[PDB]
Design a protein around this ligand. Sequence first.
Ligand SMILES: Nc1nc2c(ncn2[C@@H]2O[C@H](COP(=O)(O)O[C@H]3[C@@H](O)[C@H](n4ccc(=O)[nH]c4=O)O[C@@H]3CO)[C@H]3CC(O)(O)C[C@H]32)c(=O)[nH]1
Length: 395
Amino acid sequence: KPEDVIKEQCARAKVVAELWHGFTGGAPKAALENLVVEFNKAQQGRCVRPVPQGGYRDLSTKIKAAFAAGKVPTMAQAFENNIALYLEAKALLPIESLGVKLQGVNLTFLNAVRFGGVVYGVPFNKSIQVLYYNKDLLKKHGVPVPATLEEFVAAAKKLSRAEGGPVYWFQPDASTFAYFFFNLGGSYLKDGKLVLNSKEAVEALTLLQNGVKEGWAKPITSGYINQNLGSGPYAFSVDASAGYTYYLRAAKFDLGVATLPGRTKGQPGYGLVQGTNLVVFRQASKEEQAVAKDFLEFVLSPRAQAVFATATGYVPVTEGALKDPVYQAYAAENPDYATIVRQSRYAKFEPALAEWEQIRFDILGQAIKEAILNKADPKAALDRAQKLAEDLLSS
Ligand SMILES: Nc1nc2c(ncn2[C@@H]2O[C@H](COP(=O)(O)O[C@H]3[C@@H](O)[C@H](n4ccc(=O)[nH]c4=O)O[C@@H]3CO)[C@H]3CC(O)(O)C[C@H]32)c(=O)[nH]1
């Protein structure tokens, strides 16, 4: 196993830089480990040790405990809102001071790690939402891949009627909500203030709740969508590009990947950007930080980017990745990699507020579950979310 090879590499190493992550397994965990094994081989007495912390929520809980225990790793994965939280504690090294070169990092991704003009993270494993679909089922009913929200609803209705069950599958969560909210003209910040209960928020949540009532949308309440496949007819889902390998292994049908339905055919829908940046903690030693500098330079290299992104369906974060022949060979044999990069052009983020992790799961996510699972009124559910978010922010 690659994590055994790493335990061994670090055992002989003069300096070990720990990297805490939230990859539980599959292609992402494996791709991270393969990258680390290759880096660790180039060094003499200098190594990275990846340490799985569970999922992403677990990782930020454990990073907060590590601050309270006074023992943080050298590097960790972080969302933009976690970077914001760690900056309140002044806990992050500025990346460009470390000596990492950022020319050629995608500005979509670089702007998101820049706080008061200073970059505090290295875009690493950046996902974009895509439309997964059942190529077999759309072909059986002569339904084209939908390019607009209108067409998507119409297709889900037609196919659900035909197959006797709801064919648009979704988790009732903030990530799914974001797709429909952004594409109905929603924004979360109104003159600097967080608003969860805007008319576009009510519209988005009402669209999903109506799709359940109308028999075209299927709430997935236990596991990833890709873990529920094979139970009833499936046409479509909106999911992160990093689910690609999970969908591929699970699907008994011919899986497709398309750009997201938008307001019009003039442009694909916006997708939510997910996945994480790597940060470097101030508490690391000069020697651990030097390992981080070389590790981050390696992760931004065209070949590392090419291998990582083709092994997983993460978006390659540099312009040079798309010029690498290994990326080019993968793309030539599989049109889904270009589809994911094309979608990555039409990209929105959630707010970069320190409290956003709590808000998205415990407040916004709960309001969406209330509406979807318990037929709560959408406006009443989001009005309660607004008050709980304002109270949290005021505390
Ligand atoms: N903590 C925290 N999480 C956040 C925040 N913003 C968004 N997210 C979560 O990012 C996940 C997307 O990140 P991504 O790296 O694109 O994809 C993950 C996995 O989701 C996906 N996966 C894993 C196993 C499996 O069977 N299927 C599969 O698709 O593969 C990758 C590695 O595990 C969403 C999913 C969510 O966990 O339910 C909540 C969302 C935040 O601010 N904080």
